[PDB]
Each structure stands twice: as structure tokens, then as C-alpha cells.
Amino acid sequence: AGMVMNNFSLKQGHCLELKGFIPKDAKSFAINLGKDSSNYVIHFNPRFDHEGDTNKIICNSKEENSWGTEQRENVFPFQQGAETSICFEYQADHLKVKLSDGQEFNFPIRMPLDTITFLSMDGIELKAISLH
Amino acid sequence: AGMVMNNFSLKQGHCLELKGFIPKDAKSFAINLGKDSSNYVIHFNPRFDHEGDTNKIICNSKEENSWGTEQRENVFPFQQGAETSICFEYQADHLKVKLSDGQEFNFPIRMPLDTITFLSMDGIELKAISLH
Numbered sequence: 001a002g003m004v005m006n007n008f009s010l011k012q013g014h015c016l017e018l019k020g021f022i023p024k025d026a027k028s029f030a031i032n033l034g035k036d037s038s039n040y041v042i043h044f045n046p047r048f049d050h051e052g053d054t055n056k057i058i059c060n061s062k063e064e065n066s067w068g069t070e071q072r073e074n075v076f077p078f079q080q081g082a083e084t085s086i087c088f089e090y091q092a093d094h095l096k097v098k099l100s101d102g103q104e105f106n107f108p109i110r111m112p113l114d115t116i117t118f119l120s121m122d123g124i125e126l127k128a129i130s131l132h
Numbered sequence: 133a134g135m136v137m138n139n140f141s142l143k144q145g146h147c148l149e150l151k152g153f154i155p156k157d158a159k160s161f162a163i164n165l166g167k168d169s170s171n172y173v174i175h176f177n178p179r180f181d182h183e184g185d186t187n188k189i190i191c192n193s194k195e196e197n198s199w200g201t202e203q204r205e206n207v208f209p210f211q212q213g214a215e216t217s218i219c220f221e222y223q224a225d226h227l228k229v230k231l232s233d234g235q236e237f238n239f240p241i242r243m244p245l246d247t248i249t250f251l252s253m254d255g256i257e258l259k260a261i262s263l264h
């Protein structure tokens with residue numbers, strides 16, 4: 001399984017930047033942010049070829065281990081065998097996801113939330129995390 | 133309790149850099165690196181005023197929840213209410229701890245170890261982590 005960070009605090013109006021290396025044979029990778037392993041405010045899942053999706057980003061929420069409604073984005077500035085950096089900005093009722101090429105999209109926050117305290121990731125090798 | 137990162141991999145010959153903010157009223161802070169919450173290859177504990185120590189760094193190991201022999205360093209480039217950055221470099225039989233002012237010291241590795249996969253910290257606010 002991937003790597004987990006817990007009991008940091010990402011507060012409203014701030015962003016968490018992740019930089020990582022995507023393996024050359026990656027079919028997908030996921031970065032999860034939320035409250036614990038059962039509660040993801042965002043599951044951010046770029047898919048190269050996975051679950052029938054080619055070069056799409058699938059986002060979803062997970063509340064008490066139940067997936068919500070998926071959000072599909074055609075933006076896809078990712079390459080296999082390369083570094084990528086993504087910023088997750090926390091606003092009252094949505095996360096703003098900021099990509100390395102300047103493209104951005106919002107994802108609604110569907111669950112009660114004070115601070116973001118949990119991160120996990122899978123399919124991508126950590127290079128750096130930082131809080132702004 | 134502090135924040136925990138788990139199932140990253142810090143391999144021999146690489147370093148993990150941590151940047152964080154020391155609260156203005158901090159009596160001490162600790163950064164732990166090892167294999168899990170019971171097994172710290174290093175417990176790195178700058179003490180402003182704690183356990184009778186004033187401006188010392190106390191390091192120790194912890195194996196299956198048992199503290200080892202403490203190592204005391206007089207180097208202390210830290211201030212309360214300020215940012216600090218420290219690098220932990222992994223070599224075969226010791227960690228090299230590199231401080232922001234260029235001062236460095238080694239700490240012996242006392243336990244079986246393939247990769248470093250666990251980090252925790254207490255008393256210091258995360259700003260960034262990166263792997264080199």
C-alpha cells in the first residue's frame with residue numbers, strides 16, 4: 001500500500017503541494033486528502049489506463065468508506081516516467097486542484113470538515129510535500 | 133499527538149529534509165525516523181528547557197519501545213518562534229544529521245534496517261518534507 005500522512009493540519013485558505021514521480025509503467029495513481037483512511041474529502045485519481053479510462057482524471061469522495069459521485073476531468077498534464085506537482089487548496093465548500101501546467105478545477109466538499117488532517121497516496125513516489 | 137508519515141522509503145545514501153515552525157513557547161520538539169511507532173532509528177529532540185536540559189539536542193534510539201543510550205549534542209542553532217530545516221542522511225551504520233547552519237553530527241544505527249519507512253514529529257509545525 002501507499003504512503004500515509006496523518007495529523008498535519010491543512011486549514012481553510014491554504015494549500016498542500018505534492019511533488020512525486022510517476023513510474024514509467026503506471027496505469028494510474030491516486031492522492032487522497034481527508035480526515036482518515038475511511039473519509040476522503042478528495043480521491044484524486046489520474047488514470048493512464050484504468051477502469052476503461054484513458055488519460056482522464058477521476059475524482060470522488062469517500063464517506064465512511066462509501067464512494068460518492070465521480071467527477072471526470074479531461075485535463076491531463078501527466079506523463080509516465082516523470083515528475084509531477086499538484087496543489088490542493090482548501091476553501092469553505094470546495095477544493096481547488098491546481099496542476100503544473102496552470103490548469104485548475106474545483107471539487108465539491110460533501111462532508112463535514114474543520115481541518116484536513118489526512119493524506120494518502122498510491123502509484124506515485126513521494127518527492128516532496130509542502131504546506132502553504 | 134504529532135504528525136506521522138508512514139510507508140515512504142528512505143534508502144541508503146539518501147536524505148530526508150524536514151522544514152517546520154517552532155512555536156514561540158516551545159520547551160522542546162522531536163522528530164523520529166525509523167520503522168514504526170515502536171522502533172526509532174533516531175529520536176532527535178532539541179530541548180530549550182526540558183528534562184533539565186537547556187539548549188541541548190538529546191538523541192536516542194527506541195527498539196520495541198525501549199529507549200537506548202542517549203547522545204547529547206551542545207550544537208543548537210534553533211530559536212523559538214522561527215522556522216528550522218534539518219536533513220537526515222541514511223548511511224549503512226549511522227545517520228548523519230545536517231543542521232541549517234552547516235553543523236552536522238552522526239548518530240549510530242543500532243538496529244536492523246533495510247529502508248526507513250516511518251517518521252513522526254511533535255512540538256514542531258510541518259512546513260515541508262522532501263526526499264533527496
Ligand SMILES: OC[C@H]1O[C@@H](O[C@H]2[C@H](O)[C@@H](O)[C@@H](O)O[C@@H]2CO)[C@H](O)[C@@H](O)[C@H]1O
Binds near residue numbers: 058060
Ligand atoms: O470512484 C472512484 C473509484 O473508482 C473505482 O472504479 C470505479 C470506476 O471509476 C467506474 O468506471 C465504475 O463503473 O466502477 C468502479 C467501481 O466499481 C476504483 O476501483 C477505485 O479505486 C476508485 O478510483
Ligand SMILES: OC[C@H]1O[C@@H](O[C@H]2[C@H](O)[C@@H](O)[C@@H](O)O[C@@H]2CO)[C@H](O)[C@@H](O)[C@H]1O
Binds near residue numbers: 175177190191192199
Ligand atoms: O532518551 C530520550 C527520552 O528522554 C526522556 O527523558 C529522559 C531524560 O533525557 C533523562 O535526563 C533521564 O534522566 O530520564 C528521562 C527518561 O526517564 C524523555 O521523556 C523522552 O520523551 C525522550 O526524549
